[PDB]
Amino acid sequence: GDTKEQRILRYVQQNAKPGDPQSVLEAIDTYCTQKEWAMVGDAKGQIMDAVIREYSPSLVLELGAYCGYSAVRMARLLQPGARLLTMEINPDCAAITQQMLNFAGLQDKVTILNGASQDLIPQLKKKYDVDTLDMVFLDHWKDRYLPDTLLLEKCGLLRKGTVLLADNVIVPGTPDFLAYVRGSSSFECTHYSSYLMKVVDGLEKAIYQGPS
Template sequence: ELGAYCGYSATRIARLLPEGARLYSVEPNMKHLAYTTTILDHCGLKNKVTMLGGILSEKIKYIKDVCGVHHFDLVFLDHIKDMYLSDFLLLEREGLITKGSVIVSDNALYPGCPEFLKFLQNNKDKYHSVAHDAMLEYDNNIKDQIWVTTIL
């Protein structure tokens, strides 16, 4: 998970993880990191989640070398929208997302990640994406989309 905010997604994902699975969440805002950690602890899910403060480019070596992660089945993008493409490419370059990995991109239309969407649309031979219409989570008057992309 890239972008924890207040821990809602981390909580929803962590509670569904099978035994032995783990969620890694990277959050650049230390206040949001603290909120999420507190919520996960309160929900009894802290043992299923590794919270990392910072941005992916700063934490990727730690994730691979210290945490021993070799591959992500699922990546949830909900952080700085301008970083969706660069972080996606970094995960791919580092071999952390490969054939069959699923990437869920929240807020694809609002505030939007146009460069990332254009990249996916221009590379349909490598990625299969489906756009799901939604409304902005905090304002039902604003149309949004969630994109689900599978690496082919």
């Protein structure tokens, strides 16, 4: 068997450099640009980097590791001792992600949780010893953004100033998630447009202010 995702890891393992997350980033960026696209960006990576650098989170939740691009891009910017938790529902992508972090030298900042987001979010406190989350990046199924944001509320995982950065909120779009965070007083929201497919997409930054 030879999947697109094995093919990406293998281009990285040949062209990027062991323990250099940026040559991993550019090799992936290079692969998805010249060889076959994958569901990856440097234009939205600039936005993702600015938000990591602005808020210096000590504990990040990512929903949707996939191949490990956005986990290499985040964890490369985290301070010593900070953690990334990444949930991946497909075990083969989870293996790609473990190897992509192992090659990039970041497998000690990341913990991969294999599971659907709404099964693992309730276990975060008991099992992975989380108190609150400093940042949350949502890049999974667009119809889970809103219910997972409220599930994170329920379980008391968001604090005042938690950053939620939501990808692909324009295309495919997350209309329900955007209406809620923009309309709720618990969230202060900034929309970052980024092109893609030559289409305007966007990320939403939504900062939690505390319950209503």
